[PDB]
Design a protein around this ligand. Sequence first.
Ligand SMILES: Nc1ncnc2c1ncn2[C@@H]1O[C@H](COP(=O)(O)OP(=O)(O)OP(=O)(O)O)[C@@H](O)[C@H]1O
Ligand SMILES: Nc1ncnc2c1ncn2[C@@H]1O[C@H](COP(=O)(O)OP(=O)(O)O)[C@@H](O)[C@H]1O
Ligand SMILES: [Mg+2]
Ligand SMILES: [Mg+2]
Lengths: 371, 371, 322, 60
Amino acid sequence: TTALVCDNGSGLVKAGFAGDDAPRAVFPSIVGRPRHQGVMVGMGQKDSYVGDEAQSKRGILTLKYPIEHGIITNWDDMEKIWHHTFYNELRVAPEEHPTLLTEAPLNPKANREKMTQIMFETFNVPAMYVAIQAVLSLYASGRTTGIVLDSGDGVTHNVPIYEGYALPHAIMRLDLAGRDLTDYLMKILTERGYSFVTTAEREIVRDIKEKLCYVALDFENEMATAASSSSLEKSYELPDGQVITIGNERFRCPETLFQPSFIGMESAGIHETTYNSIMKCDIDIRKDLYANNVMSGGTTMYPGIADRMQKEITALAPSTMKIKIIAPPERKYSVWIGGSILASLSTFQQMWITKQEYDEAGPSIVHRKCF
Amino acid sequence: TTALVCDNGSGLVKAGFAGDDAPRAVFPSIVGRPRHQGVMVGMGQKDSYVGDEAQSKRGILTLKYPIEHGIITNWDDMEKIWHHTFYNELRVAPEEHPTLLTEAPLNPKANREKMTQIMFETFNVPAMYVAIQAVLSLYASGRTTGIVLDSGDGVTHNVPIYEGYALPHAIMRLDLAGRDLTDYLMKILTERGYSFVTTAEREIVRDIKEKLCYVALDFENEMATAASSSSLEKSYELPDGQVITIGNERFRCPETLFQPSFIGMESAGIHETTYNSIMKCDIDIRKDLYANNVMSGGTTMYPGIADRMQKEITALAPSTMKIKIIAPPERKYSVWIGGSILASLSTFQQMWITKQEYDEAGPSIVHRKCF
Amino acid sequence: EPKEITFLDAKKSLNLNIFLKQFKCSNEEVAAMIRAGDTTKFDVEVLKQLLKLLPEKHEIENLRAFTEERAKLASADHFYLLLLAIPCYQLRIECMLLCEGAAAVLDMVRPKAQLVLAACESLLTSRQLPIFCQLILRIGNFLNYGSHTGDADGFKISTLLKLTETKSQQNRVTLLHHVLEEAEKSHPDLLQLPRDLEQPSQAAGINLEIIRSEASSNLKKLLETERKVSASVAEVQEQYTERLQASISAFRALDELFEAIEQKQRELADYLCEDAQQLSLEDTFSTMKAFRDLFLRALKENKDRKEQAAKAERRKQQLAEE
Amino acid sequence: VPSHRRVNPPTLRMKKLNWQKLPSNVAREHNSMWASLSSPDAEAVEPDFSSIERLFSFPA
Ligand SMILES: Nc1ncnc2c1ncn2[C@@H]1O[C@H](COP(=O)(O)OP(=O)(O)OP(=O)(O)O)[C@@H](O)[C@H]1O
Ligand SMILES: Nc1ncnc2c1ncn2[C@@H]1O[C@H](COP(=O)(O)OP(=O)(O)O)[C@@H](O)[C@H]1O
Ligand SMILES: [Mg+2]
Ligand SMILES: [Mg+2]
């Protein structure tokens, strides 16, 4: 039987079958309830809408984004999202397909235990495995040992992996991602002169972040030519006719990943958390950490992030002139694609958690099979 | 030379001489035009009534507000408002008096260009100034720091300001004020059978909103009291001699200020907007802002707004630090009082915008001079 | 007369003019109630603005070296000369600011510290809370039979948070819902369980170390100010010593109350059988506030469930009648 | 010996439950509320085990 892979994202939950090149379902991490009061019949309107149906009818719906910074806080809405993800998005029953799952790094243990007990008691899966998004992100590149930068919509993390097994001591957290970049992009486009108070304006700024924004090889040099660059200044058309012009901000929104002092916090960047996370490991693994550095998430689609990661790791680490930072073109879904690669293999059949293991061991099996 | 303070608000224009306590010319900003035909030849049938003459003769006039949501939409009407308030009310030449003016926060720049060019080219002045309404409202209270919430006729905006430094990012604006409460009062008065559809009747509904409405301290208890006993029902006499009696509409009409879902807006109440304004500030100066909440604008004339506002802020915020509401009885004219304080200073002579500065820098020096 | 001979710059004179114009009176009266010791027109913010607009060393030297007519000066400079005419004016303004701040901090902290003391005293002595733990552990020891987690004779208070984590087959009824639904039928005294624990309700809602450091800093400042007034003249003594002694006595009673909170915190740590090195004070109050909110929502959702069951039963009897 | 330990064995498989087990010598102190569980004089509420068995059992 074919397996199911879902990436439970902070901003985009993806779902599909194992072995597929692309996820079949990509829907935002939203649960909508009807905004106004009114009952009638109306040929049986649903009490709750999730996903693409929630996106489509979103004017008469109040939405909820229940994942805050990678970490699950509201659990019933995750249960409703997982019920949509199985029963209508893929149109399956979860009691015969083994289901691979994703966790944010530095997840609390009670969250993993609650996640496992809701998979085994409510949905009653016959097999489930929780993987860190970075481990699947390394599996999409096709290796088993190395450090991986993963920045999604919730939170940025740098995770070292040894033979498929992560090291939770040297995982480091940077408290920004594509939602925080989106908020900063509304902030500096408002400083440019615009205003985004509505829903559709926020979606247009999200698509501006999708299309136009990039990372330069040098921030200071591209500042130095910013007034004089004829190719830097882009723009975008809203469908009702509003025009949004963006200039140097195209490489100020993702450079918040490289320098978080742009927005006003003193946390270390995506290259500095990577370097500090490499030094917190054992010494022997660190060359394999530099050799298999994979960036992942939709927050790494900015063109020219590869050579800037190269130059920043070149600046911090004098041993890393020639090693290349691997950037797959499909690293939007490298968590999902690596989950497809991991679940589709015939070597993964032992690593699944059975129902009887949860029954005899409790929820704490997630501490001991998923490591 | 006596300066002139002229708050050209959305609801009522308040103009007078500087250095005084009360504005001499308080009159609503409406332009009345006769929708019917004239048969009575002679006796000065002038085609556009402006001010109190439009108010007194309102039963045959279409009334247009030149200000809509704090934006000067109609410009010929607003010029007629300025011509009436200079020549008919104050009866002073503009060329021998400085004229202080007020403005809403987050205004368009070309709007400021247009009021500057009308105040320098048509009505020539020796000097003029444009100031934020919340800053003058704070200066009437006599303190240098604090948060000013101002609820006019179209705009309810929150401005926190610390030592005169107005924080731009922590200013925000909610389009829910007295005209929207008036329209909701028209909508809910038809439940009792009273119809008001004409613009002449908007003055009557605004008058009963001024006279009879009040903020409930608790909405559910006042609902139970109004449903249980008819003790809170109050009568009003219309100008045609008919007497109406209203019940729960005395408090259902200002409750839109705390619950915008009545008129169908997704945004929260003014307490939550004040709270989100406070969290946008730095954490050190929040203690000064919580004890210095200053109201201004006539929409805060409902005699239950202070205790309910203190209850809502003390419930929503953490209770570590002091919650104090500054609600002076003369806060309706606190914009004019603060303008009269600011205009009558010896240090203010060098912040005036002269005619020579206008000739040097166009109608654009108000951007670089004022905040 | 544009030569106002003001020794200040434009900005500080502008701020002091805005400050002076709020009092709606002459600056002679302002220097009078600075000297006479009045607290009616001076709250914390006005005294903070006055201390933020103090005269500087060169400004005081230029005012003292001034020898011409006093009427030629500005209102700011005449106010500073009236301020300098007051002996130890900065000490008197500091006595104003510290007595008003001490009174405000005392009226804020003292009912909340009494609420914390009543909270921990009612947590140490509760009536229906043993019977509620009896019913909870009876159902819990029924449920986890034959496992390694079974056959326990107690739990921490954090297990009261974990009651909400339980959900039924319908994913709508919690364990707390079922316990309160059975307690509504069998033993209604557990429904009077929040009545004893209403003084544990709302928690502290604060951090006790922040207000304790602020109270200790205020008491230290009051002791320093009392020592400085003791070095000053007898007019300042008769103006301020009784109020400073009352403030020091009230803050000493507050420190005795903080020591009682520490002793009852150690008693509450031994009461729930947890070591005192971990946070057993704010975690327990936030725990009890959270659990009492869970109790109130469970009560009203069980009432709403019974009300909608009765309404559905009335609708079923209606459609059977018709 | 205690009343809460007297649990009948149910016929059907029952849904499990998560909290953290703590030792019994710690929990039977004089300052603990479960000494009233250790004393038989307290109000003994009998749970309807048939209702939990018909409701909360595992479906086959
Ligand atoms: N082409 C793109 N360029 C830039 N940003 C993009 C692009 N496509 C999506 N994004 C943004 O990046 C984020 C999507 O990344 P991703 O799918 O990895 O997040 P997630 O899985 O929801 O988050 P997390 O892994 O923290 O749970 C969103 O904030 C989205 O707006
Ligand atoms: N006594 C009152 N009670 C309740 N509301 C009032 C009262 N007086 C005025 N208002 C409302 O407040 C507004 C006062 O206008 P104001 O704030 O002075 O200028 P603007 O709102 O045009 O900027 C009016 O639109 C009116 O609806
Ligand atoms: Mg994801
Ligand atoms: Mg106004």
